[PDB]
Amino acid sequence: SNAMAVQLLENWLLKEQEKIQTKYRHLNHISVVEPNILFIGDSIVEYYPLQELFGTSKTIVNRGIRGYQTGLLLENLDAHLYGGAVDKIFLLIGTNDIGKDVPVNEALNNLEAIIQSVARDYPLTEIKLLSILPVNEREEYQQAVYIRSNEKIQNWNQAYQELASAYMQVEFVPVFDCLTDQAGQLKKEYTTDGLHLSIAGYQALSKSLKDYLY
Amino acid sequence: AMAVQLLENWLLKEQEKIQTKYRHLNHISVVEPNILFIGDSIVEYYPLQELFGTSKTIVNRGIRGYQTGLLLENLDAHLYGGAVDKIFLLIGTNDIGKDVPVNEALNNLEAIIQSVARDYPLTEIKLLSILPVNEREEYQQAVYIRSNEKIQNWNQAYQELASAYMQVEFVPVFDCLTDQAGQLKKEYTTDGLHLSIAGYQALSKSLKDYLY
Amino acid sequence: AMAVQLLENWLLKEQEKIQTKYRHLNHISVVEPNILFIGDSIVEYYPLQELFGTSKTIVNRGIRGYQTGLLLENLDAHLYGGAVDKIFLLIGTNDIGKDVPVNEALNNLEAIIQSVARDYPLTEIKLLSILPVNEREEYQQAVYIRSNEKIQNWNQAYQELASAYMQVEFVPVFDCLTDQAGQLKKEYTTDGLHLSIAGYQALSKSLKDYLY
Amino acid sequence: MAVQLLENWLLKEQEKIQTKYRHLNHISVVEPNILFIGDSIVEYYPLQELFGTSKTIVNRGIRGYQTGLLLENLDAHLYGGAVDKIFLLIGTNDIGKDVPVNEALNNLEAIIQSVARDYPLTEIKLLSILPVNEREEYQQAVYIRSNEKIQNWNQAYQELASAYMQVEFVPVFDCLTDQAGQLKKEYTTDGLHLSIAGYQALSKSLKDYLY
Ligand SMILES: [Mg+2]
Ligand SMILES: [Mg+2]
Ligand SMILES: [Mg+2]
Ligand SMILES: [Mg+2]
Ligand SMILES: [Mg+2]
Ligand SMILES: [Mg+2]
Ligand SMILES: [Mg+2]
């Protein structure tokens, strides 16, 4: 690598995120569907084949953005919310806070502020706060997994669970264990690069989430 | 006796026609019901779109004159959709009006609940309290043998049934609709039994939070 | 004669009740109609939501047994909204059924069109052809004195009236509902006059280019 | 060479999407009524939020795609037992890479023939390639594409469509141009890709072909 190229790639990620935020802000106004469920979060959400794995009878709208962290979501929360009859918001975020060494208390405070902001504007809407998903710690996946570890992820998940217990409208959704193998790693078949999910991974995640859609 | 029997025949014919309509519509409908409203004439004549709006797709499967037995026997006509979040059920005032024994009506309702629990396992049933009537003499032609004392007793039984089933929530709306004398408000009714638009506005306001 | 008068009285009472319902709903509806459907029982009973969907807000202002004169007299009950794009009007089969003189019905329709042109100047009116009936003897109870010959003559008059008014388009749907004998298809009808769900599917398909 | 490795980036991202689609084709829980196939403009198209879900429309677009890549990997883009229509938007990257028009048309003809045998009751809607905006400010995305080229390719697409009863040419180019014949500024992000206003205008133009 090359530090000039480092900056410009960081710049590439920022401009892609800004482009997607702009896209969502305009769709929020002109969309022809009413979201029953909004899926909000990071790359795992953006790339989730929601239609093809959950079907179309329940309208689930994607408001995920690659590389997102809790602070970015809080700052731009308006891009991720619309509709007159939102039953539930599914929130999957934090793996990138871990990958950037964001203090857990800062991430939590960010999540708490998101919950409170949603309560004001969407008072009858439930939030399903997903466990951060496991990673695969095999050497071959070190490039995507980076400083994430399943011990850190499990510690954050304990904190998310405690945060959920403080709000009647928030339910913690334990999906971590559904995606692990017997060594407590994200299953090889469920991953492309140790962090992101394969289609088998998304299928397994969807099976674990289905009941929470109702 | 003879003309009254022919009127009962009329009603049955109309109900059968509506059941056919519904079976056919369920098959080719261009919408996915988020919520199904099922019940008797108070449901059939409910102006759902104009009082709740269309953010949620709320589909009407009500039938005038319906009773719990008729609904059970024809339950297939009243259910469709791939992701029904909620079924709102308002029925029983015609069971009372026809002197159907409460235990029969409650067994019919339990069977409905168990059927939906099996076939629509993640769907919630919102079991409404039967609505109050107005017992004043001027409304006797519609109200007939119904009384608010009977209705409240049946509502207690509905509440108890709902308590036995995870997917069922009893929705107490009776009290929203009464005047200080415990009668369906005169302004809320057309004939002492059916609702005026003001009655439907009051009912809608009471149901709004149960939609989520 | 006593009972025939009572049946007339029954219908009159129900129509008045629906007019009151609509006047009240017009006042407090939570939706802005993009399209109003106005007319007789074929409109009242039209499953608009489940056949057209809800991408546009389509509001039902039909009344069973309606005739052009009753609609004109009560036109206020059928119209509301701050930006109505289209009004679909299906009416006249009960004028024919009651032997209303054609010139009277056409004068009534012209008055309705002129009223809407004044009060809803940016709204398009879609004036549907009266639908065919089935003339087979099994359907004589509903069909009565209606005939496809009379209906087609009235439709020619409707087309002429529409041609005179800028914001009125005649919508020829009659031929979309007939079999090879020129009758309303048996599968399209419940009683020879009213539509089955298949008949409403065919009518909805033929209206789609005028709606969207 | 950084450009060699950017070419390599794109190829690897395309292969990853092909893998994803091939697996989805097997385990999808929906029966697509309409498949949208093509390049970046398709991948990034907000189909659900702009067309709604009265019909099940499935996205099988891939960024940077060209007619040859599509033909070689056509299996990744097709599935379902009841597909009413396929919408195909592709060619702007063939123009951008200076692929001979004859080569691109033979690839498209090969694609149409393959779909014909496997999906005989399915209509193919072959879209006109969309206009670009030729202003200098957009040159990083637009590159060697010109509206003159695009219109010439669209004439050829129209002729190819005329040779198959199952294929209808869908002329949307003119719906997206300004008075100078450029892609309208408010319809574009970078002179080539569409803004949401652009996708809404495209959707409005396509509605009569979808429903
Ligand atoms: Mg909680
Ligand atoms: Mg649960
Ligand atoms: Mg319960
Ligand atoms: Mg009072
Ligand atoms: Mg709920
Ligand atoms: Mg006159
Ligand atoms: Mg052709």
PDB file of C-alpha atoms in Angstrom, chain B residues 7 10 17 20-22 24-26 28-31 45-47 49-54 57-61 80 190-191 196-198 200-201, chain C residues 10 17 20-22 24-26 28-31 45-47 49-54 57-61 80 190-191 196-198 200-201 208:
ATOM      1  CA  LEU B   7     -86.437 -12.870   4.952  1.00  0.00           C
ATOM      2  CA  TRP B  10     -83.004 -13.806   1.690  1.00  0.00           C
ATOM      3  CA  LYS B  17     -73.256 -14.797  -2.705  1.00  0.00           C
ATOM      4  CA  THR B  20     -68.565 -16.829  -3.369  1.00  0.00           C
ATOM      5  CA  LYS B  21     -67.411 -13.290  -4.128  1.00  0.00           C
ATOM      6  CA  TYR B  22     -64.742 -13.559  -1.448  1.00  0.00           C
ATOM      7  CA  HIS B  24     -63.053 -15.715  -6.051  1.00  0.00           C
ATOM      8  CA  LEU B  25     -61.451 -12.407  -4.952  1.00  0.00           C
ATOM      9  CA  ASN B  26     -59.012 -14.190  -2.610  1.00  0.00           C
ATOM     10  CA  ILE B  28     -57.049 -13.059  -7.986  1.00  0.00           C
ATOM     11  CA  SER B  29     -56.695 -10.017  -5.709  1.00  0.00           C
ATOM     12  CA  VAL B  30     -53.895  -7.639  -6.784  1.00  0.00           C
ATOM     13  CA  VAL B  31     -53.060  -6.641  -3.185  1.00  0.00           C
ATOM     14  CA  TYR B  45     -70.079  -1.637   6.232  1.00  0.00           C
ATOM     15  CA  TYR B  46     -66.906  -0.268   7.902  1.00  0.00           C
ATOM     16  CA  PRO B  47     -65.384   2.562   5.845  1.00  0.00           C
ATOM     17  CA  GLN B  49     -60.088   3.212   3.631  1.00  0.00           C
ATOM     18  CA  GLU B  50     -61.569   6.585   4.493  1.00  0.00           C
ATOM     19  CA  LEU B  51     -61.040   6.287   8.255  1.00  0.00           C
ATOM     20  CA  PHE B  52     -57.669   4.471   8.460  1.00  0.00           C
ATOM     21  CA  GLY B  53     -56.135   5.543   5.151  1.00  0.00           C
ATOM     22  CA  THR B  54     -54.118   3.359   2.855  1.00  0.00           C
ATOM     23  CA  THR B  57     -53.582  -2.360   3.129  1.00  0.00           C
ATOM     24  CA  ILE B  58     -56.606  -3.269   5.198  1.00  0.00           C
ATOM     25  CA  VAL B  59     -58.943  -5.741   3.443  1.00  0.00           C
ATOM     26  CA  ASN B  60     -62.616  -6.202   4.231  1.00  0.00           C
ATOM     27  CA  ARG B  61     -63.906  -9.719   4.768  1.00  0.00           C
ATOM     28  CA  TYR B  80     -55.790 -14.939   2.067  1.00  0.00           C
ATOM     29  CA  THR B 190     -78.062   4.633  13.018  1.00  0.00           C
ATOM     30  CA  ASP B 191     -80.526   2.086  14.380  1.00  0.00           C
ATOM     31  CA  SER B 196     -73.012   6.058  12.276  1.00  0.00           C
ATOM     32  CA  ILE B 197     -69.888   7.640  10.816  1.00  0.00           C
ATOM     33  CA  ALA B 198     -69.250   9.292  14.212  1.00  0.00           C
ATOM     34  CA  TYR B 200     -67.002   4.435  13.248  1.00  0.00           C
ATOM     35  CA  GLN B 201     -64.676   7.404  13.937  1.00  0.00           C
TER      36      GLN B 201
ATOM     37  CA  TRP C  10     -86.902  -0.473   1.820  1.00  0.00           C
ATOM     38  CA  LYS C  17     -78.891   6.034   4.810  1.00  0.00           C
ATOM     39  CA  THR C  20     -76.068  10.392   4.917  1.00  0.00           C
ATOM     40  CA  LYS C  21     -73.043   8.112   5.368  1.00  0.00           C
ATOM     41  CA  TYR C  22     -71.347   9.679   2.337  1.00  0.00           C
ATOM     42  CA  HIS C  24     -70.546  12.582   6.729  1.00  0.00           C
ATOM     43  CA  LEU C  25     -67.552  10.690   5.282  1.00  0.00           C
ATOM     44  CA  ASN C  26     -66.903  13.487   2.746  1.00  0.00           C
ATOM     45  CA  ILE C  28     -63.951  13.798   7.799  1.00  0.00           C
ATOM     46  CA  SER C  29     -62.279  11.329   5.409  1.00  0.00           C
ATOM     47  CA  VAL C  30     -58.546  10.974   6.022  1.00  0.00           C
ATOM     48  CA  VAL C  31     -57.764  10.404   2.311  1.00  0.00           C
ATOM     49  CA  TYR C  45     -70.324  -3.485  -5.035  1.00  0.00           C
ATOM     50  CA  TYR C  46     -67.158  -2.986  -7.108  1.00  0.00           C
ATOM     51  CA  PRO C  47     -64.080  -4.449  -5.396  1.00  0.00           C
ATOM     52  CA  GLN C  49     -59.114  -1.996  -3.828  1.00  0.00           C
ATOM     53  CA  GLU C  50     -58.568  -5.624  -4.668  1.00  0.00           C
ATOM     54  CA  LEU C  51     -58.837  -5.263  -8.455  1.00  0.00           C
ATOM     55  CA  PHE C  52     -57.078  -1.907  -9.053  1.00  0.00           C
ATOM     56  CA  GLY C  53     -54.801  -1.733  -5.997  1.00  0.00           C
ATOM     57  CA  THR C  54     -53.956   1.352  -4.089  1.00  0.00           C
ATOM     58  CA  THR C  57     -56.561   6.567  -4.040  1.00  0.00           C
ATOM     59  CA  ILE C  58     -59.860   5.440  -5.609  1.00  0.00           C
ATOM     60  CA  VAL C  59     -62.964   6.169  -3.527  1.00  0.00           C
ATOM     61  CA  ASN C  60     -66.355   4.474  -3.881  1.00  0.00           C
ATOM     62  CA  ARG C  61     -69.436   6.697  -4.023  1.00  0.00           C
ATOM     63  CA  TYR C  80     -65.167  15.639  -2.300  1.00  0.00           C
ATOM     64  CA  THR C 190     -74.436 -13.469 -10.917  1.00  0.00           C
ATOM     65  CA  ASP C 191     -78.096 -12.753 -11.812  1.00  0.00           C
ATOM     66  CA  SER C 196     -69.388 -11.799 -10.863  1.00  0.00           C
ATOM     67  CA  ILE C 197     -65.720 -11.390  -9.904  1.00  0.00           C
ATOM     68  CA  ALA C 198     -64.728 -12.557 -13.417  1.00  0.00           C
ATOM     69  CA  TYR C 200     -65.396  -7.212 -12.563  1.00  0.00           C
ATOM     70  CA  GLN C 201     -61.953  -8.474 -13.701  1.00  0.00           C
ATOM     71  CA  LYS C 208     -57.173   0.350 -16.916  1.00  0.00           C
TER      72      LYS C 208
END
